[PDB]
Amino acid sequence: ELSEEDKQLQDELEMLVERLGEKDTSLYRPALEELRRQIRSSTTSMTSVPKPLKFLRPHYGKLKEIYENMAPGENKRFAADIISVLAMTMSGERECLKYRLVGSQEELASWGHEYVRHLAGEVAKEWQELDDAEKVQREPLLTLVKEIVPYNMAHNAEHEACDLLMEIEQVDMLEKDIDENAYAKVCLYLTSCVNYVPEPENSALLRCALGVFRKFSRFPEALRLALMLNDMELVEDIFTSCKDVVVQKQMAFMLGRHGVFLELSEDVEEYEDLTEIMSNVQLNSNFLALARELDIMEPKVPDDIYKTHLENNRFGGSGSQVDSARMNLASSFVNGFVNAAFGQDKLLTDDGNKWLYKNKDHGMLSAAASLGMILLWDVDGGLTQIDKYLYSSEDYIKSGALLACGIVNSGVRNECDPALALLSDYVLHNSNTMRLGSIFGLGLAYAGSNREDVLTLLLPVMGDSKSSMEVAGVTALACGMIAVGSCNGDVTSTILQTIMEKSETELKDTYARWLPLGLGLNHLGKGEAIEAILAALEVVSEPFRSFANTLVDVCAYAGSGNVLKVQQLLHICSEHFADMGAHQGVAVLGIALIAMGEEIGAEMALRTFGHLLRYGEPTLRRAVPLALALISVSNPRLNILDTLSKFSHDADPEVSYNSIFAMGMVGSGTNNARLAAMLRQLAQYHAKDPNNLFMVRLAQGLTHLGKGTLTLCPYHSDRQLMSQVAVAGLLTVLVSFLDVRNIILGKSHYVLYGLVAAMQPRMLVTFDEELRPLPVSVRVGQAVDVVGQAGKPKTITGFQTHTTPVLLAHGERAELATEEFLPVTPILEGFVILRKNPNYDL
Amino acid sequence: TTGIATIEVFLPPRLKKDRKNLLETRLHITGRELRSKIAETFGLQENYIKIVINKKQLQLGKTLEEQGVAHNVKAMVLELKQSEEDARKNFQLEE
């Protein structure tokens, strides 16, 4: 019950509210003045219970009607203020809003923080309740926001300000209202909220954050959000606005990492240095330094990688003297991938022709591509060795050499463009293998280029009726992955015409799946323009109509997180009815690629995939491991590996094959000794089937990629920056792997080399302002945010001290433990430039 | 000017020289003269080098003008482990 002070205050409140019965002149001003005074005193204090509000439980009906009849001036406004404060505690949402709306304006700050928050919530509720039928109510709510937002800004309440500004769908005022000490908080809030908000508000929020960062001149972050938006005009605007040459070099490094090559005018000083950095010619050299820091110059051999000295030699000296072709292809992939990018191998460099001569047709192409893939990012160094094998006796393997070129020029660009020159006279080659090699090399060398000359040169291949189905598919995929995430009308129209003119009998083959691929590869991350795409694709008949629609639906929403598209895809998967299950497989890959945008969505996609596996039909069971591989590329999560190990022994050969490839992709480059042991056990168990052995050895090569210093992650910048080229590469490999026997185990091993398009390295090489390497002590650990929305860089814990260059595993980041240097980019990934601290004093 | 080109010749990184160099050349000469002049300018074996021009493969029997060469055109220089004809015969012999 009450107290003496409480009872006296209750009596005073009751007297003040009861005096309003009649219309005496000295009632409305005195009583409302007293109520205003008490309410303001209680509300403008600590969060203590508002004692006047607790005591006040009257009815305002008489108060509302008298409001209607008495004092059209300020007294009704005082009454409105009082009833608004009273109804903030009660449930009078619309009335409580309109009391502040039409009553005494004064200011929302004069009431209290809680009153401001409640008014903000009610304003958001009304705005969501108000449609475009009338804009009369919108303007006063906007005026309320005009004062609500600065209140939150000045009282560290940026949460409510940002939320309200997202409800009203208007975010322009953040440009003119954000302070120096609060830009990071709101910017991080937006860059985290963009992933979960659906279309089209995510793009508006992204451009709002872009404008904020431009206003505060945080140019690297502006570049990050510009690549998030995937629009070149604002990237060019940021490039022009960058007046600091060190920031220019940093943004060139990040552009090269993302693979975005924008033409630079000669008006910008130091054009040559920026161009050569963006071409990423230096990377290999740094990689070499990397390797000579870890004493891993010496390349490995497949015999030691398989560890034959440990396998139980049940048949000794009688069952291993025969060298089958398929195991030779697997050993080529191993003695490639494992030793790749180190500039040397002990079996393909000194005994090349002898090795290649024990391969047949497809083995020739695979080994020729692996010869270039054993030396990465050295265009001249790679081609100096590739030319002789291009001059080979078996001119059919010439195409393979082109792959080598295309696999050597990957991740780099030259002014003279050796790849374009070398393949310009070979693209029009009538031989199917020659044209295939030419187009594949051109695509791999020019991933993400979007250069009009190469696209125009690739156009006539689609209209060539002579060109075979697999030539058409490889051409379509190369065109798509040269024009990743651009919605190029030229390529879209060309592929649409090619598929429209294609016959059903010729469409029934597996390679026709690669026709939507490039089309889909033209529309990565842009789901707005795909209504016309689906309308155009609706002309073709089912089932391939549904197949193409599903594939373009995946490609449109790559990482979008649109749960409605995932619901449609899950409905497709759950429909229990050969080619009919292709739709379900593509939809499963769609759930994977949409959910990999967000960590939460991905981890729930894990549970959905488990449910699909334990309760799905054979086609879904085959499809899921590819999805699991897509979800966690180069992220050896133990639960995923355990599920894949459980299903590697399944009685369905396709399911086991897909599970093995999922081991290879998920644990790629992590050098996981547990994964290596499990793969050795799988090789021992599957020692009889050539296909299982081939794919398990491929998985071992993938997991020993670069001796553990290479990753296939399509994500960068704390996994927030997507990579269109890498996403394209994994998409091609996975959709080809939807049919392992006909494509992977058939005539199309070269498709595996598309993963090298996604081949991106991990280091911590630190450069000075002049780009010389600089050893800096670095604190490396997990980025587990021990705070909420404090704006912290996840507050790296699990500390370990390192000297650069350093190797960072997936999910573990780094920070500068020394204040002597300041990084231009606060995200310590890849090559960075540290400016000497001017604030530090000796 | 005066029917000449300042060709931007790009040497391989193995030869520790300037990555990009300027060479003052004419246009009426043939690809053989082109490779010979690069070889004599930057100290390479003429039969052990391949030259890449204007995003096209050099036509050794066709002059520079008719193979697309123009002013300010890049020129990749690639070392050969074995000479062009020598590599052709060496590899094609092994069958």
Side-chain angles (χ1 to χ4, degrees):
Chain A
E1 68 105 2
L2 279 80
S3 85
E4 48 273 358
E5 309 253 1
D6 277 350
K7 178 84 72 170
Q8 295 306 323
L9 263 290
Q10 166 122 338
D11 284 324
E12 296 152 28
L13 264 293
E14 296 290 16
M15 157 196 331
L16 265 297
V17 74
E18 265 283 356
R19 278 172 58 256
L20 298 142
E22 60 151 345
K23 277 75 52 192
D24 192 14
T25 300
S26 66
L27 279 180
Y28 301 150
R29 276 296 180 175
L32 287 170
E33 263 154 3
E34 187 78 8
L35 287 205
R36 190 126 157 180
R37 207 214 69 75
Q38 304 276 27
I39 269 179
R40 288 271 181 79
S41 65
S42 276
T43 321
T44 61
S45 47
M46 301 213 272
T47 167
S48 168
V49 50
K51 291 227 253 174
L53 290 177
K54 158 162 151 278
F55 303 147
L56 281 190
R57 284 273 68 77
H59 81 320
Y60 79 104
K62 72 133 190 173
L63 285 180
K64 187 37 75 173
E65 62 89 27
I66 190 154
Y67 182 125
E68 301 150 16
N69 82 334
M70 55 150 246
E74 291 325 325
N75 277 348
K76 73 202 290 179
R77 309 223 172 185
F78 278 37
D81 296 10
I82 265 69
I83 53 186
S84 55
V85 180
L86 181 67
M88 155 204 80
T89 292
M90 281 315 78
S91 181
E93 171 215 11
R94 277 297 84 77
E95 283 104 346
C96 166
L97 188 141
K98 49 173 184 62
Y99 299 153
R100 191 37 177 78
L101 156 76
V102 300
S104 176
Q105 284 300 326
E106 172 96 350
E107 49 190 12
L108 288 110
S110 76
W111 296 112
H113 207 313
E114 327 91 344
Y115 183 86
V116 171
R117 298 150 69 99
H118 205 314
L119 254 298
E122 294 192 356
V123 155
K125 269 190 152 199
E126 176 47 50
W127 194 281
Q128 303 296 340
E129 207 193 349
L130 173 55
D131 303 1
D132 280 279
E134 49 159 321
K135 278 80 178 178
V136 199
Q137 314 169 350
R138 268 182 183 91
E139 308 125 1
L141 302 190
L142 288 177
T143 65
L144 283 180
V145 172
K146 302 304 163 281
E147 333 291 344
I148 284 173
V149 166
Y151 190 94
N152 287 175
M153 301 333 304
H155 298 129
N156 267 26
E158 319 101 321
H159 277 197
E160 299 102 303
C162 293
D163 305 326
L164 237 198
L165 296 160
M166 301 165 28
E167 319 298 354
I168 42 187
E169 315 274 12
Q170 183 274 340
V171 291
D172 189 18
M173 20 201 82
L174 295 116
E175 305 271 273
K176 46 188 163 191
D177 214 288
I178 285 173
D179 264 311
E180 298 91 311
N181 317 60
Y183 85 105
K185 309 208 150 60
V186 46
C187 277
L188 171 85
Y189 193 92
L190 307 172
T191 56
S192 273
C193 179
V194 47
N195 326 313
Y196 309 95
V197 57
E199 293 300 325
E201 328 190 2
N202 42 50
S203 294
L205 173 147
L206 256 183
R207 55 181 162 223
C208 175
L210 195 40
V212 167
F213 265 143
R214 293 154 89 180
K215 279 206 175 201
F216 284 84
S217 206
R218 278 275 75 194
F219 279 141
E221 288 76 21
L223 163 153
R224 313 240 152 161
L225 326 187
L227 316 149
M228 249 163 209
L229 191 42
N230 289 294
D231 221 3
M232 47 303 279
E233 35 263 30
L234 318 88
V235 182
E236 161 264 307
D237 290 355
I238 298 165
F239 216 107
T240 64
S241 298
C242 278
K243 333 262 186 160
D244 193 359
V245 78
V246 188
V247 189
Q248 294 238 30
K249 289 178 189 170
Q250 212 73 83
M251 80 167 155
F253 262 131
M254 311 336 145
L255 285 159
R257 164 81 210 181
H258 189 297
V260 166
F261 211 108
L262 56 104
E263 50 109 339
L264 196 46
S265 305
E266 222 42 54
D267 73 326
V268 172
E269 278 195 329
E270 292 204 356
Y271 156 82
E272 315 277 14
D273 205 41
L274 297 159
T275 315
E276 66 93 7
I277 286 175
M278 161 195 258
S279 62
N280 235 335
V281 297
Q282 219 147 347
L283 152 74
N284 190 5
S285 84
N286 294 315
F287 209 108
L288 295 169
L290 204 172
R292 73 199 61 256
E293 182 28 58
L294 275 88
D295 284 5
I296 50 161
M297 291 335 307
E298 194 250 16
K300 326 296 287 296
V301 145
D303 207 330
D304 60 67
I305 297 151
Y306 309 153
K307 193 178 275 280
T308 49
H309 332 80
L310 182 141
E311 268 92 47
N312 183 207
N313 268 342
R314 312 214 174 202
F315 297 94
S318 204
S320 191
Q321 280 202 349
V322 156
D323 305 352
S324 181
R326 184 180 311 285
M327 30 156 78
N328 259 256
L329 323 186
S331 304
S332 68
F333 283 123
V334 165
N335 214 353
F337 285 134
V338 175
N339 309 350
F342 287 103
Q344 54 197 40
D345 173 38
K346 334 176 289 217
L347 192 95
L348 193 36
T349 60
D350 293 353
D351 281 328
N353 305 352
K354 161 149 288 191
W355 181 348
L356 321 175
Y357 281 6
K358 65 200 163 80
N359 311 326
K360 52 141 304 304
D361 196 287
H362 314 325
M364 293 325 288
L365 275 163
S366 308
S370 148
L371 217 177
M373 161 205 98
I374 204 51
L375 329 175
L376 281 308
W377 309 304
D378 45 348
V379 180
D380 290 349
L383 295 213
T384 38
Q385 320 209 27
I386 290 323
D387 68 338
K388 185 193 61 53
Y389 301 85
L390 154 75
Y391 287 14
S392 170
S393 49
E394 191 179 350
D395 38 5
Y396 148 83
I397 91 162
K398 270 200 168 187
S399 38
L402 330 172
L403 329 181
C405 303
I407 217 160
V408 152
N409 274 289
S410 74
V412 277
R413 281 225 223 179
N414 292 22
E415 305 210 349
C416 324
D417 277 330
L420 182 47
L422 190 140
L423 281 322
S424 57
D425 300 340
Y426 285 0
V427 278
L428 57 145
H429 206 307
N430 222 36
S431 196
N432 270 333
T433 74
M434 288 297 104
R435 188 174 293 179
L436 202 85
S438 313
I439 61 193
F440 209 2
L442 215 53
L444 299 153
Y446 282 174
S449 302
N450 279 257
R451 33 198 308 152
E452 301 184 356
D453 46 355
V454 177
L455 297 171
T456 43
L457 180 131
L458 270 281
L459 296 182
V461 196
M462 311 331 281
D464 182 25
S465 173
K466 164 257 148 189
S467 293
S468 52
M469 301 294 103
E470 106 299 338
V471 161
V474 172
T475 327
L477 72 84
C479 291
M481 67 177 204
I482 287 159
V484 278
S486 67
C487 281
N488 272 17
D490 162 5
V491 191
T492 301
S493 52
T494 316
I495 297 175
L496 153 78
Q497 290 334 97
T498 317
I499 66 189
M500 271 315 98
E501 65 99 22
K502 197 45 70 196
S503 60
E504 179 206 1
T505 40
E506 291 166 326
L507 275 166
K508 210 183 176 198
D509 58 356
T510 89
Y511 288 99
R513 295 177 166 184
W514 298 356
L515 296 162
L517 213 164
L519 179 69
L521 232 43
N522 215 17
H523 314 313
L524 321 167
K526 297 179 173 172
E528 290 199 4
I530 325 289
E531 276 52 44
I533 306 303
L534 62 92
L537 258 294
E538 205 176 358
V539 185
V540 82
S541 63
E542 293 178 20
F544 274 77
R545 178 198 282 163
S546 49
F547 184 93
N549 154 286
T550 48
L551 190 136
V552 301
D553 194 13
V554 201
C555 269
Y557 297 80
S560 85
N562 193 314
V563 304
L564 264 299
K565 277 315 173 175
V566 183
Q567 190 176 355
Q568 304 170 13
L569 259 45
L570 164 153
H571 276 290
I572 294 171
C573 296
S574 66
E575 183 263 338
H576 168 27
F577 36 64
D579 292 331
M580 37 297 304
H583 313 338
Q584 288 169 141
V586 165
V588 152
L589 268 310
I591 319 147
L593 162 53
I594 301 172
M596 56 150 275
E598 289 72 60
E599 300 82 320
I600 286 176
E603 216 195 22
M604 250 77 86
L606 276 281
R607 320 164 96 268
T608 69
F609 291 156
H611 277 24
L612 263 56
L613 285 162
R614 86 142 292 170
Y615 280 145
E617 59 180 350
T619 166
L620 285 182
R621 205 160 301 197
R622 310 148 202 276
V624 168
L626 327 161
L628 279 167
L630 187 45
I631 282 292
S632 272
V633 170
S634 315
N635 186 0
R637 322 207 216 171
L638 263 199
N639 44 11
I640 300 189
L641 267 294
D642 174 80
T643 60
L644 300 175
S645 64
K646 288 168 66 63
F647 282 170
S648 61
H649 288 280
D650 193 4
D652 186 8
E654 196 99 15
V655 163
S656 179
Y657 295 154
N658 294 338
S659 303
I660 294 316
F661 195 44
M663 321 275 268
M665 191 85 98
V666 161
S668 45
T670 89
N671 201 358
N672 194 327
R674 155 165 279 97
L675 172 52
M678 291 175 328
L679 283 185
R680 292 165 215 285
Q681 273 198 357
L682 289 169
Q684 151 181 49
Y685 173 83
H686 292 282
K688 286 333 208 177
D689 171 68
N691 301 340
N692 264 312
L693 275 202
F694 161 67
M695 203 118 46
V696 86
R697 282 164 170 205
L698 166 72
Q700 299 209 137
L702 261 289
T703 200
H704 287 115
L705 192 65
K707 304 166 202 160
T709 88
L710 298 172
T711 58
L712 329 167
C713 290
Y715 268 177
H716 181 70
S717 157
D718 213 307
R719 312 313 170 176
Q720 270 269 288
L721 184 141
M722 81 86 68
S723 192
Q724 284 178 346
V725 37
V727 156
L730 293 58
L731 214 44
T732 71
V733 178
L734 258 52
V735 301
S736 59
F737 250 100
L738 273 157
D739 188 353
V740 302
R741 317 150 320 285
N742 309 45
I743 294 310
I744 304 308
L745 291 156
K747 324 322 161 283
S748 301
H749 329 316
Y750 51 86
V751 179
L752 275 69
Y753 294 107
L755 279 191
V756 191
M759 169 88 57
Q760 267 299 306
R762 147 71 60 209
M763 62 305 297
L764 216 33
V765 188
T766 41
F767 296 132
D768 209 341
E769 316 278 272
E770 160 277 359
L771 292 154
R772 262 181 227 124
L774 153 57
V776 163
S777 83
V778 168
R779 164 141 31 91
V780 166
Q782 279 58 267
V784 278
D785 46 345
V786 302
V787 298
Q789 212 258 339
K792 289 309 187 307
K794 261 53 65 202
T795 321
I796 292 167
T797 60
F799 103 99
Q800 293 303 40
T801 46
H802 315 244
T803 167
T804 51
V806 197
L807 267 62
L808 307 149
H810 188 95
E812 150 207 82
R813 321 312 315 153
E815 86 96 21
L816 283 198
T818 47
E819 63 214 351
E820 196 67 73
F821 294 100
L822 321 167
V824 181
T825 288
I827 302 98
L828 300 200
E829 296 188 10
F831 308 120
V832 291
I833 312 160
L834 321 89
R835 167 176 301 140
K836 287 175 177 156
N837 190 3
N839 164 269
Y840 179 100
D841 292 26
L842 264 287
Chain B
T1 77
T2 183
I4 61 102
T6 312
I7 181 144
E8 294 80 2
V9 33
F10 280 50
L11 316 172
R14 195 202 73 168
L15 308 181
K16 311 297 167 63
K17 308 281 172 305
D18 194 3
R19 175 174 183 267
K20 150 200 167 301
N21 315 262
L22 318 169
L23 190 61
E24 167 110 347
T25 88
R26 283 276 180 181
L27 328 169
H28 63 316
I29 57 199
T30 325
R32 190 92 36 181
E33 290 83 318
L34 169 42
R35 65 209 304 279
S36 320
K37 82 182 170 249
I38 324 305
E40 71 159 4
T41 301
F42 303 101
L44 321 95
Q45 294 80 78
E46 193 212 293
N47 69 320
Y48 270 50
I49 54 169
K50 205 281 183 197
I51 317 298
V52 157
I53 312 299
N54 70 28
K55 338 293 181 183
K56 285 226 89 174
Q57 162 153 283
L58 257 197
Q59 324 282 323
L60 295 195
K62 313 185 41 68
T63 201
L64 265 55
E65 283 204 75
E66 72 192 307
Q67 60 203 180
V69 197
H71 311 311
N72 285 339
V73 167
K74 296 127 285 280
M76 171 36 48
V77 178
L78 190 61
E79 301 146 300
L80 266 63
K81 204 152 71 183
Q82 186 102 62
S83 180
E84 49 273 337
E85 303 300 334
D86 302 45
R88 284 153 79 168
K89 307 304 197 323
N90 161 7
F91 221 137
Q92 285 159 336
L93 270 165
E94 316 145 356
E95 295 207 14

